[PDB]
Each structure stands twice: as structure tokens, then as C-alpha cells.
Symmetry: D2
Subunit: 480 residues, 4 copies
């Protein structure tokens, strides 16, 4: 084996070490070719054809870039080629656990199909990685290139999912900075974002990307509270605030697009309807369901966006209901968007409260004459938590900086030191309401319920409120 070059449209020509190639050329990794990065987003942004596979290559490459840069700049860190490869592998493999349509699977389907279990794509990535290593005899190949499987497989898993006092076993405290590259638990500034910003923008057809190359050139390792951490140059602080602003922009415009979400919702509904009747064969010929394939990696290996088409193309009558929903997607007969609002002030909505919300909307009594009367089951309520990655916290408060005059001395920089034009809050909730009845009269009624409900709950006035519900909006004194 020798090193391979591959042309990526985002990064150009990148080199891949033979070990990485061996990892890539497996059913477990190749599976990522058949999972869309943005799931239902493609049905809104026709440029967004990209899959997890190419994103993974980018993440692995950037992980390598960062660790190489640090090693060249600071030999004293004692970064070894062994270290570099482990970081690249973690980067490559951090997306291994994603399921059909990416966040839809993790975010919508599994929570509804298997409420008892707690599952995340991160956990899946670690399990898949284990399966990949074992199924394809990788450990011998790792030792051939100087890796120590016991320590290094631990290290790689830890980089992806965190710890399985210094809580890490894969590397010691002096190599702490290595854990900040692939998946940064401290502040979320990592190479995964850097790739998806550039990649998604290229495919979506939008600007606003983050300059990671610049950032890498000004990154350094310094001691902070007896730990070696990656620090940014002071002047980059504005760029970091911009980075998270960009993330928020991308989520508003693309990843949480009202219609993209509704399509994901419909797909999830179809999957629930099909869950009983689809069988996926796993280890030992044993059969699993869409919802239980996460228990067996051999079965999960076979679980991709394909299932969408399996259902769509099915002829079995048991799958009729599921198939019908997907057909409605093709005809673009989607559930209709009614509107969006937000909680005012201190109110926050708990996940346990989510199931009640359609009931609440149907319970509203708008003082308007209606031809039709709608029920809880006719409404969909989608609650979206928008933040800078750290719930209420400002991630920049958890970044360490250094200045030109003392490169080894780490410092903190507060928001007030940067700008008054920055956000005063770093978390919020969006509530979108849709109606399953698409007819004109139903839709009119749904708007009356929706706006009334917003008023009843003292939520923010929807932007089109005066148009969609002119009779309702005047009642609320606050609104005008």
C-alpha cells in the first residue's frame, strides 16, 4: 500500500495515508455514500445532494491539517505520527453512526420509535467503528503502521464520544489539546464545523463561510489551568463570534428550513408506519426493524436512505399507509405551514410538554366564525432549540487566547471587551405549526387557532399575524 490522493471540491487535492484508505474501503464506511448530509434539505435546496461520505473525508483531512500545523509550529509538544493518524481516524469516523437522512433519524425517528432508549449518532459512530475494525481485520494493519490498538482505539473513541481528575485513558494530560480537534466538548470549535460550513455553502448556494485556514495559522497550544490547550490569537475573537453567527444563519435558512423540516417529519411518519413490516437481517441471520437495527451493527450497516425507496417502491398492502405518505411527498402535497412564534421572556418549553402542544392549539377558542373544526391530530407542532452550541452559555467565554507580545501566556476575553453589537442571549426557541388538512377552509381555520393560541400563551406576534388573522390580533394589547 501507498498513500492516495483524492480531489475534493472543497479542499482540493488531499493525501490519504494507506491505513486511512483501508478504513475507508469497507462496507461500514462506504455506507456513508448513501446518507444525505442534510436529509430533507435536498427537497428544498436542490444543490444539497451531498452525502456524509465526502464530508467525512473533509473532516479527517482538516483534523490532519490542524494537528500537523501545531506539530510544525511547536515541536516541544512531542506530537507523533502515531498521534496524527489517530486524530485523522477519529475525524473520518465521527460521522459513522448517522442513520437514514442524518439528523432526522437521531432527532425525530428514534425518539418517537424508541422513547425508552437514549441514542445519539455519536454513540452509533463508536459502535460502528468497533464493528468496522473487527469485521475487516484492521488491528493488524494498525500495528503495521506503528499504532498500539489498545491505547489508540480507546483514544479514537474518546475523541468522538468523550470519556467512556484527568478522565481520558487514550492519552495523558500533556496531550490534552488533541481532544479539542475533532469534537470539541469545551466550546464546540472543531474541524467538523469547518468542513460542513464550507461544504454545505458550496452545495446550498450560499455565502457566509468561516475561514478555518486563517484560524489554523494563528492557533497555538498554551498551558491553561494545568492543561495544554489550543489557544487562538486575540485578534481572532471577532472571527469566532462571526463563526457562530454563521452557524446560526445556516440553521435558520437551511438546516431548520420550515419545509425541509416538514418533509423530514413526513418521512419519519412513514418510517413509523413501516416499522413493523420492514425486516433488516443482522448478525446470525437474525431480523431487526428500522427502529432496532441500531442494536446490531451488521444490520445498521444496511440501513441507509435506501429504505425511503424500499417503502416508496413497495407493493405489499401492509406498507400502503407508509407508501402513501411518501407518494404525497412526490406530488408535493405536504402538510401546510401555518406559522412560527417564540416564547416570551422566561418561558421555556420542555421536551415532555411537546406531546401536549397540538392539543393546546386545537383547544384555543378564536372568536371567529369557522366553517370547519380542527382536532389535535390535525396539527403538528415543531419546537426548535436555537443556540451557539452551549445552551444559554457563550462559547467564547470558554475559549483561550494569546497575544503577540506573549505567545505562551493564555488569556480570556469577555464579550464587553469585543463589542456591544454582539447578542445578549445565546439560546432561543422557535415554534412552527403545521396543519395536516391542506384545503383552503381548513387552512384559514388553522391560522385562527394558531394566532389565538400565540395570544393565549403570550408568545410573540407572528410576522404575518395581521394578515392571516386580522380579527384575532387586535385583542392582544401588547401586540399593538
Amino acid at each position: 500500500d501507498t498513500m492516495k490522493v483524492i480531489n475534493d471540491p472543497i479542499h482540493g487535492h488531499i493525501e490519504l495515508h494507506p491505513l486511512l484508505v483501508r478504513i475507508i474501503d469497507t462496507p461500514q464506511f462506504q455506507r456513508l455514500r448513501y446518507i444525505k448530509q442534510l436529509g430533507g434539505g435536498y427537497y428544498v435546496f436542490p444543490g444539497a445532494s451531498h452525502n456524509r461520505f465526502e464530508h467525512s473525508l473533509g473532516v479527517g483531512y482538516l483534523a490532519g491539517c490542524l494537528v500537523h500545523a501545531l506539530g510544525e509550529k511547536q515541536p516541544e509538544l512531542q506530537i507523533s505520527e502515531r498521534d496524527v493518524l489517530c486524530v485523522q481516524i477519529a475525524g473520518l469516523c465521527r460521522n459513522l453512526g448517522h442513520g437514514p437522512f442524518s439528523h432526522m433519524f437521531d432527532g425525530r425517528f428514534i425518539p418517537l420509535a424508541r422513547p425508552e432508549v437514549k441514542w445519539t449518532h455519536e454513540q452509533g459512530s463508536v459502535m460502528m467503528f468497533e464493528h468496522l475494525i473487527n469485521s475487516n481485520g484492521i488491528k493488524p494493519v494498525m500495528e503495521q503502521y506503528g499504532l498500539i490498538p489498545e491505547e489508540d482505539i480507546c483514544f479514537i473513541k474518546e475523541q468522538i464520544v468523550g470519556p467512556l481528575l484527568w478522565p481520558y485513558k487514550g492519552r495523558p494530560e500533556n496531550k490534552s489539546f488533541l481532544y479539542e480537534i475533532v469534537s470539541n466538548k469545551r466550546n464546540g470549535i472543531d474541524v467538523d464545523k469547518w468542513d460542513y460550513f464550507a461544504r454545505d455553502c458550496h452545495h446550498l448556494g450560499i455565502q457566509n463561510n468561516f475561514d478555518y485556514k486563517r484560524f489554523i495559522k494563528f492557533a497555538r497550544v498554551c498551558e491553561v489551568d494545568n492543561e495544554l490547550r489550543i489557544c487562538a490569537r486575540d485578534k481572532e475573537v471577532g472571527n469566532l463570534y462571526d463563526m457562530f453567527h454563521t452557524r446560526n444563519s445556516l440553521h435558520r435558512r437551511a438546516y431548520q428550513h420550515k419545509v425541509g423540516n416538514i418533509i423530514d417529519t413526513m418521512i419519519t411518519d412513514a418510517f413509523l408506519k413501516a416499522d413493523d413490516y420492514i425486516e433488516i437481517t443482522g448478525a446470525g441471520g437474525k431480523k431487526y426493524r428500522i427502529s432496532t437495527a441500531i442494536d446490531d451493527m451488521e444490520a445498521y450497516t444496511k440501513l441507509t436512505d435506501n429504505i425511503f425507496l424500499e417503502i416508496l417502491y413497495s407493493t405489499d398492502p401492509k406498507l400502503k399507509d407508509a407508501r402513501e405518505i411518501l407518494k404525497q411527498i412526490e406530488y408535493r402535497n405536504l402538510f401546510k405551514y401555518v406559522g412560527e412564534t417564540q416564547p416570551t421572556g422566561q418561558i421555556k418549553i420542555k421536551r415532555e410538554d411537546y406531546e401536549s402542544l397540538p392539543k393546546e392549539v386545537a383547544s384555543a377558542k378564536p372568536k371567529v366564525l369557522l366553517d370547519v373544526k380542527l382536532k389535535a391530530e390535525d396539527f403538528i407542532v415543531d419546537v426548535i432549540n436555537m443556540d451557539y452550541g452551549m445552551q444559554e452559555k457563550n462559547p467564547i467565554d470558554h475559549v483561550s487566547f494569546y497575544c503577540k507580545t506573549a505567545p505562551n501566556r493564555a488569556i480570556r476575553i469577555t464579550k464587553n471587551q469585543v463589542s456591544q453589537l454582539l447578542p445578549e442571549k445565546f439560546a432561543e426557541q422557535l415554534i412552527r405549526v403545521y396543519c395536516k388538512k391542506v384545503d383552503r377552509k381548513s387552512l384559514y381555520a388553522a391560522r385562527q387557532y394558531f394566532v389565538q393560541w400565540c395570544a393565549d400563551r403570550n408568545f410573540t406576534k407572528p410576522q404575518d399575524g395581521d394578515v392571516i388573522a386580522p380579527l384575532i390580533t387586535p385583542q392582544k394589547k401588547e401586540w399593538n
Copy 2:
């Protein structure tokens, strides 16, 4: 009414409601599940794009061109009816593509059904009819002022040429002849399909080359040529046109005919042939078809996409074992091995009927070198690629009409000699790639000896690595 879509290539494009109705059908949406470049994605990880988004682009550019001509030359009497028909033809010219695009019509069908002659273009017309009839489009066409009898004919003619002189078209008369040059230009191949795929494929492939269609549109005009109204280019654009075809040739050499992309397409085709007996696709009336016969029924063909690849890969039926095994080898990157490339010298051209014999010929070569292993015809694959400027031996620029700034209504011809001596002296050639199914080191060495000997025996060109792969053979040929 109008829908706006963000396309990463063209930006925000408007779509007329009629076009939206056509798009929102199973027949059109199917194009989301067919890769533009098929196996190319397995070589260029940026090339995740599907036929769907390319189709939008072609339809939009078709509209751009016809609009531009109408603004510039009102006397042409171009109607909104005309504009819509051209846009529909642009949208729908890719409807007939099958799994992995050119693989299907280029490799699979010719081998699976040799008696039949089938092209994606014919498929597009049949699919279009099925789309119209299945979704009640004709009433909607009339609603927007189209005349289905004439206009459906016109649209089909734009895609496939005459359905049968002097004037062979029924959809529009001679005065509107220029309209037939927009979507699919049979005269010289200069059309909006190429313009979109150049820009789109380069964006996704990661290569900066493309053709400036926007410039070209600004200098395009309609003039009378031989009693026909034709689109003419400004004289100064002649160099850019030669460059356009050069770009096309570059793209084919580097990407579309990439040695490994082709071999992957070949393996997939082989797997499909092995699965053809056992896969069933349900068409009209519940009747079952095979991969190779789904082209007979559009309802079945509607369900025939890249999905089939995964159906086979994930199958457990033992009858599909052989097919499934081939696809598994693809995932492990255990591909048939590239041996080399050569070209015919001088007079000789290779006929399609000769294609079967070629592996036999290579196995029949007797290299004068000691070999551990002896290879057979069945161990070789020979892939013959015709590279040209779209018109076999002819120069497409000889079939372009120009005009000059001093007499915009007077059409002229421009010969190659009037432009440059740095242009090609031929416009067609053949590439011959040889692969070996036995991948082991000793087999591979042997295959190289057969190959190079064969080239010498047939007076083909010396392979570029010939002195390295077959140092004992190359000296025998004095020419080399």
C-alpha cells in the same frame, strides 16, 4: 404563481407554475435518485449530484436563451407559449436516463438487449408521455395557453428530433426553426444541456474549467441561413467555441472516461446482468418486469433508479449471491485492475461488432517472456472509447453560422484556417483500455506482457509506461 429555487450554479431562478406542476410528479422526482456521473462519484467524491438538479439548470438556461433572443429581436414573433415549450423540453430531456446515467444506456442495455436499440433520448420522450398522461397535465397546459397537440409534438421533437423534407418538423414551422437549436442541437451540438453540465460538473468535480454561456447568449442572434432561421454567433466568439469543445474533451478524458470510474461502471453492469433474472419490478397492471425490460413499461421504469444497486447489495436471496458479491468487491475496492491504454495508428478504426473478439486477441498474444501464470480471454476486459467533438470525424465549428458587427443580419462561415494553426487537425480518435480480472501480482505482471505485446502486434501506439511495465517487449518494436 412563480416559484423561486436556489441553485448553486445559477443562483435564484424563477419557475413558471406549469413547470412546477411537471416537476412535482413521480416521473420527474425520480431524477433525484440517479447520479449524473454514475460511477464517477466513486472516483470524485464531490460528484454527488443527480440528474434532477441538472434538469432544472437546463430548463432554466433554455429559457434564458429564448428570452434573450425575443428581447433582442421582437420580429421573430417569439411567444410566451414558445418560451414555455422550450423550457419544458429543457427540463425533460433527461427524463429517460436510467440507473447511473450513461452506464445504463451505454453499457447495460446494449449487452442485456442487443437486438433493441435504445437511447436515453427515446426514454425521455416515452417518460414525458407517461408523465403527461399519468398526472393530467394537458388540461393545465391549456389553462396556460398551450395547444397540447402541436406543443407536445414540438417538445418531443426538441428532445429526440423528427418523429419521422424539406421541413421535417410538425411542432413548429420553418420560421421558428431556430427554436430547435436550443435544447438539443442536432446540427452542431451547441446547446444549453452542455452549458449547464460544464458549470455544474466542474463545481462538483473540483475543476475550475467551464464555458462562459452567459457571454455567448449576449452575442447570439438569429439570421437567415439557406432559407432557414438559425441561431448565429458573433464572429469573435469562434475561438471560444473551439475552446468549448476542448473543455468538453478535457472533462471526458479526466472525469467522464476516468479509467477507474469506467471500470466501476463495468462491474456494476456485470452485477446487473447477473441479477437480471431475479429482480422483479412491478409495472402497469401489476405485471412484472426485469431491469432489462422495465424500459418497455414507463410505470416500471419510473421505479428504476440507483436504488437497484442497493437492493442487490443488501439482498439475502442466494440467487443474487453472484451479483451481490461483485458489488461487495466494489465496497472493498477490490476492482478489476487497469493494465494500460493504447490507441490505433493511422487508417484503422475499431467497429462495435469487433468488440467481442478483442479480449480473445489479447489472450492470443505470445510475448517472448517467461510467465508463471497463463491468462485467458475471460480474464481480460477491453474498453473502447470513441473520443470526438460530438460529430464523429467532423468539425462542429464548420456547422456553425456567424455574423459580424458591421452586418448583423448577414450570416457567414468561418473555416479552421481562418482561426488558428494551433487547433486540432483531427476531431475523432479512439482510446483502448485494458483491464485484468485476476488481481494478484503475478497475474498483473503477465497481463502487462500480453497487453504490450498485443499493442506491438497490432501496431497500436506505445503505452506511456510501456518501457517500465514491459521492458523486454518494447525493444522488439523498432518504431517505438
Copy 3:
């Protein structure tokens, strides 16, 4: 005939012959010799671009917007005459810029001629008048159907606002929306920004811009307060906030770059020193100074970045002091950046106070031993007002929107209806301090004065404060 130009930002643009005639004059061609970003080029080597190409872009976008509105809403009665007037205003709104753009109106003139109030906008109107009269344009305007009396008034009003109830004479109230295109006095959303965002980013090497093409597609004219105004679709509100965020980012990183500014400051200083000795010939053979060329357009026509080189290459001993400063720029022996701070709370710094500030810093009395003692004249204090274009106000409160369900009904959208992640203030001040003595000991001293002076005035703690002034920062409890 129409002329076509290839602009790297917009591609191939058509220009009406009238516009070409305006462009092909000394008054317009002068813009080739004025850098868009002045001293910025000395920090961003990509930023070679001049006012000339930016002007073409603004003119073209002005045309795009007005064309789009006309096509969408014929009832507006927009005439080709209207379209040309808007394009001319767009082309000519940058005519009044002087050497190094904002340096000239922002730094040089205020210091050279404090009694006078002068702006590039005023200059643009005067230059335009001179251009028209010097080159016999009025006859050509009439040839293409313009009415010079009304239309020249209209064009000047678009650039500078009312030349003084409907306050405009160039067009009536029904055409009020036309005044929002080139230079939008109501909220600053205009085509000038749209071009410079894209152009500067292309040249600077920053991937950010605003998608004006999207915005244009969703723009409409509606009646607001008995005036016809351009309204944006409700869903674009987030993009508008993003637009102003991008503007702020660009000012922070590029237009107010600490070094770019100091270079502009040095150039200004050199100009002041040369002002007495340079002569520029204006109308009647008559001589003016850099600072008085603004009084005569014939002289101002000859006033460009050239003067920089005139001084640099001079041999006259009277120009020695000026020439020496420019030489220091070439050797990169610049005044040294000491640091940046901001006023706390609601403290604001008045323009009249600016001269006193260097004195205040020299007066500070840091409790540290210093080898050297610095004086007011050794300090430069640069006060930068950063806002969203409307001082304290939020421009989005002065935008009108419409919704999908009632396109003719204008609405307002408050910040609270959009997001809590938006800024709570829309204006702030940055204070940069530099030292004219560049030696190590002087620089160390300057840092102590600076930080002490921040503490004394309860300004924000400089980002590197603990490093540059470790003995000073502990005294201030607030800081830590």
C-alpha cells in the same frame, strides 16, 4: 449600440450607449486612479480595485432592480427613461471621491479645511454637472428621450437627496420608490452596498457577501403612508439583519483595519505638509491646492492617487517633509499601534473632543518606572463610530415588508418578532491609540500611558492589557 463588458463580479453586463458616452470622459475615467479602499491595499494586497469598476457594478445593479420591478408590476408605469436615469445615478454616485476614497473626505479635508463641510456625495453632484457640461451630454440625453431639466434634477436628487411635503422635483410621489434604489436615505438598503460587498470580498479574500439576487426576486412596491415604497418579503427579514452584520464585519476586519487606518493617517499627514507646494491647474489656468481643488471641478478632475506618487518622486526640498513620511511608509516604518479600547456604558465622544485626547493620554501618570517620557504630539488617537448606518437606530425598523397571503399590504416587523440572538444596540465607538516614537523603550512607555488612561477613564480593558501593562491592570478592580 449596446456595449458588453466582462465584470468579474457580475459577468457580462450590457451598457446602453448613453451610459457609454458618460463613461468615456475624463471625469469618469478619473475613477480608474482612485483605490476603492485607499490604504487598505497596503494591508490586503488583493484590494487593488478602483472606484471605476465599482461604479459600473452599482449602475448595473441599479438597472437590475428597476427592471425587475417594472417586469413584476407594469402598473408602476416605469419607463425606459426612468431606467436610464436610475442607471446614470448609480454610475455617477462615486464621482466625487478623492485620492484614497474615504481618507480624503474622512481625514484630509476636515483637517485641511475645518470651516468647510464637504462630502463625496456633494462632490459627485458637482462632478456630474461638470461632466455633462464639459462633454456636451445634454444633446445626447435628448437623443435618447431624456428631458435634461427634469432628469438631471432627478439624478442629482438620487445621489444627494433633496436639493432643498414631497421634497423632490425630479419625479413625483407616485415614483417615490425610485429614490430608494441608488442611495437609500430611509434605511441604507441600496445597490451601492450590494456591489461593494461582493466586489470587496472577491478582492479582499473574504468569503462573505449578501445575496442581492435573491432579494431582488422578492422585492415589491407597496403603498406605505401614502407613498409608494419598495417592500421586502417577510421571510427576508433575517437576511437583512445578516446584511448589516456583514457590513459590520467588513468594517472591523478591513475598512477600519488598524494598520490600514494608520497608513491613511500618514498619507493625510504627508498631504497636509505638501499642500502649500503642490499646484493643480483648474479653470482659466488657475492654480489650486490639494485642499482647494474641491472648489473647481476642472482641477478636481486631475486630483487622484497620483498625488501620492507626485510627492514620493519629488525632488523639491520644500516637499522633503511630506516625501519623508511617504518614504517611511515604503520602508514599513509606520506609527506603532499601541492598543484599542471602548467607552463604557452610555459615554460618547464628541468630535470637538478629539483634539484633546492625545493630551489626555500623555497626562496619565502610570505608577511604573520609565526610561523615556512621552508628549501629546507623540500620540495619535483615532475614534471610530461603528453602527448599522442609522446611528443608534435599527434600520430594519425602517423597512417595509409584505406577506405571501397579501402581497399589496405593507407591514412592519419588530426585532422581537425575529430573534433574541440579534444585537441590543446598533452603535458603538472604538478608540485606537498609536505612538509616533517607534523604538522599543518608547513603545513600552506608550503602553503604560495607554492602559493607565483607559483605567483612569473607565474604558474597557484592552484585550492584551495584562500582557502589555501587567503592573497597571491589577489596580482596576472592575477588570480583575
Copy 4:
């Protein structure tokens, strides 16, 4: 410490302190005031870029290549000293360019000072010497481990070639280093790589060569008894494409008919101003635009500024020069008449160039003309278009290697690649312009021009049947 700078083409690049010191001098900064494409800006409004930023790019790419080779092949013994010398050469290879770049060496000097043979390359070496000596760089070079005697020689040799192994700056084992900045063997060098990307970015054409790909597949192998840079066999197509792109750029942009004529007008103005402009050089001595190349202190002050000095002048002696520049501003340019090429064997010699306007005026078109034109009314511009090696194919002078034997250099012939490639690699374009711009003069000039083409058996101009319908029928060959 290293300086980081943002270049729109390459992104954020690091510069070694020594390189910064070289850059921060009047001799280098002067390149900010010289347009990369001269008169091209007056056709492509994107092309505002100057030699300065291009020079940074070339220096950076020179560094990239040498770094890549060193990492891949430690056995080459490439030292940091070597890397810096290559970067400096890259930075400084454009130092010798004059007002409006190629206009100055290509048009002005040849006419102003025919006896002298001058090239920007020679200027770059002289400027470099002046830069080093004026700014005390040698001490700074030794501070960073360079050996000025050997290394300054090496740098000059990289720019201009030699001043048996003919190089003194480095020995035969380091021969590959001379192929990076300015490749005399086949023209494949980092200068091109930067200007392709840079010019395309500014021009607004999406054309280009992937140098990053190429660097990844470049290797050093022994060829003859010389260590040379070799390309992977599979890159051969890309190399042919590279030169095709170069040709495309020259046709569409660098030799644009109008960009050339503007350059020609500016040159004419400079000739008219040459007597009356004075530039102060060493010892307070005065030079002319045409003699400033003799003194680097004067040449340092010679930039695109001179264009504006003339334009803004009020001295009556500069009236004629000033008037020409004014015509440029009004867009009252000399008019393009047409373009043709020589047929078959024929080539046009440089000595023949002065006669050409006379020949065109001597043509006797059989058409009635209101006005009669003279030699002085015509401009004839002969452009040699080639792949950088006159008649030769540069790819015949490239060495390749194959994946199965990376240390074994090979040759690859055109026939082994494709029959769609060019059969010739050099040609000549002949553009004719007229100084009389009125409609009737133009019409006349077209008749002279086309007649002249026919008389000389040159190729039929593309618009010939339109501009000279009465002339084209006479020539049977044409039709």
C-alpha cells in the same frame, strides 16, 4: 517572526522575516504602481491588479514547490537556505518590469532605443542588486544563514539564467532548483501558475491550471546526469491543457486587439514626451523615460505614474503627448481594421516590421475611394503566438515517471497522448489599425487591408466578405 498575509488567490500565506525585509523597500514597493496587464485594464475593468501582488504569489508558490520536494525526498538534501533563495528569486523575478509591464519592454524600449537589447529579466537582476545594496540586506542574509556571494549569484541565475555545468550559484546535484522560478528548459514554472489563477480571478474568466494537483505528483529524477523535476505520466494531458489555457488567455486577454492598441497609443505618447520628462537618478543626474533603465535609482521612480504626469501636464512641449492620452480617455482610439495570418512556409522577420505599413498603403484595391491613405496612417502589429518554445513542443522537453518505477524518468511523445492535439505550436497574427478614425477613412483602410492580404496570400480575414465584399471575390483560394 513570520508575517501572514491574505492573498485572494492563495489565502493566508506565511512570509519569512528576510522576505519581509526585501519587500519593504522602495524597489519592491514600486511594483504596487505597475499594472500586471497594462492596457488590459482599459478593456477588462477587473484587471486592476499590479505586479506587487503577483510577485508575492510567485514567491509563495516557489516556496510551496521546493517544500513539497524536500518533504517527499529528503535525499535531495534541500536546505532552508535553498528554500529561502528560491523564494527570493520568485519574489524578485518581476522587479525589472516598467510602466505598463510588457508594453515597456515589448513596445517602448525597442522603438526608443533600438541599439540596446533590454528585457525585464535583465532589469530584475539589476534592480535586485540595487535593492540589496541600497537597503543593507546582505547583513540580514548572513543573519539568517545565507552566504551572499554564492546565494546572490544563485538568485540572479534563477531569474536570468547563466551569467559543462554553467551555473555557479549551485552545483549539478541541485540542478532541479533552477526549474522552479523561471524554467528555461520548457517554461513550466510557478510564475505561470500564479498569473493563470490571478489573472482569471481578476479578468472574470473561469479558466485555469491546477498547480496544487501538479505539485503533489512532482518528483526529482536523474535525467542524463542531471537531477530534474519530473511529472507523473498521467499529468501529461494536464500539461498540454496548461499550454492551451495560456494560449486562450493570450488570445482573449493579453493580446486583446484593443488592449494592444491602447498600449500602442501610450507608447506613442511616451515617445513624444521622452525629451521633456526628466527623472533624477544617482548623483542628482537626470535621465529620460528611455534612459532610466541605465540607472536603477532613476528606474525606481519609473512607474505607471508617468502616464498621469503627462496627462496632467500643462507644459506646451508635452501638448502632443498629452493629447494622445486625452484621446484615450475619450475612447477616440486608433481603429482596428482587421487580423490575418501568414500561409504555409511564410514567417515575418523583425527587420521586416517597419516596411509593413508601407506595403499596406501600396496595395491598390480596385474600388472607388473618397480618401487616399498613407503609410503613416497605418499601424501593423505582428504577434508571435506559441507554446513558449517557438516551433517546438514544450512537452517534448518534459520528463515523466510512472507509478511502477518512480525513480525512472521517461519521455512521452504527442502521438502517445492524442491525435486531438495541435500539429503546430507557433503561428503569427497580424493586426492592422488605422490612425484616421472617420467613417470614410475606415472604409478605405479595410479595402487596403484586405487587398494586401490577398496580394500577400495571407489568410482571408474572418469578416472579409463583409468589410470588403468587392475585394474577396478576386482571390480564388478564398472562394
